[PDB]
Chains A and B, each alone.
Chain A
Amino acid sequence: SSENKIDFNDFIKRLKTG
């Protein structure tokens, strides 16, 4: 189950957002 694992692509997106 995805539940608690990090979403890598989302993380990278978040970094770019500032």
Chain B
Amino acid sequence: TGSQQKRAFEYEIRFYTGNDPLDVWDRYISWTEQNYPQGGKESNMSTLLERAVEALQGEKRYYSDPRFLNLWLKLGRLCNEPLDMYSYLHNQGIGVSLAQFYISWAEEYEARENFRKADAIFQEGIQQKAEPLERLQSQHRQFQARVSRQTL
């Protein structure tokens, strides 16, 4: 049943007749987190992410798609040094028009208590008017409140 759904996805990757292959990967990834909420070796997540990126790599039509960004962000969280992934996306122009990119990037710096670089990431996202801008600005404001709270 788990077995059956995984097999169905694997066959869909092969036989998909549409023009948006990211859809198959995106549904396969989200079924996988729906069904393995705290991960596990049986989830196959990290290998699924690697396979998804490998299949869609260099597909620039997707560089601004949030499902694409998602694959990379999920992959990055499973890397020894998530900053390598953020900088990569940044160099390649993947996700650079999305607020979520800057939010997650800024969050990684905030988690290490590198508040100054977290702030700079927000500032760049905002200058680029990354979307949605109001969500990005709201998120920035609350990042600032968290820092203030930690310095009283």
Contacts and interface: CB of A to CB of B under 8 A. Distances in A.
B10 interface: no
Interface of A: 2, 5-9, 11-12, 15
Q: How many B residues are at the interface, by size bracket?
A: 10 to 19
B79 interface: yes
B79 A8 contact: yes
Interface of B is mostly: helix
Interface of B: 46, 50, 53-54, 57, 75-76, 78-82, 84-85, 88
Contacts of B84: 8-9
B80 A12 contact: no
Given A8-B88, A9-B84, A15 B79 contact: no
